[PDB]
Design a protein around this nucleic acid. Structure first.
Length: 48
RNA sequence: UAUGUGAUGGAACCUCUCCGGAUAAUUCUAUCUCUUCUG
């Protein structure tokens, strides 16, 4: 995909979200965060 | 809009005095961006 005026997220996976602390253990963990299409349609690293 | 037997006003140089001057290498590396949902 490419950039659009609708700016609706179309993506999944990548990145490890940092938690705002946890009840048991506080450490980095990977989550399936939604993301927007890159703007490449050096235009090699972009997300939302 | 004068008044008459009498007008050198062509009868007078806006003249004189004062450095557009002083100071400045056309040079060059650390991020940028804020909301994530109990995890």
């Amino acid at each position: 995909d490419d950039k659009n005026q609708e700016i609706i997220h179309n993506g999944v996976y990548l990145r490890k979200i940092t938690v705002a602390n946890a009840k048991s253990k506080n450490k980095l963990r990977e989550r399936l965060v939604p993301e927007f299409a890159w703007y490449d349609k050096s235009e090699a690293a972009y997300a939302m």
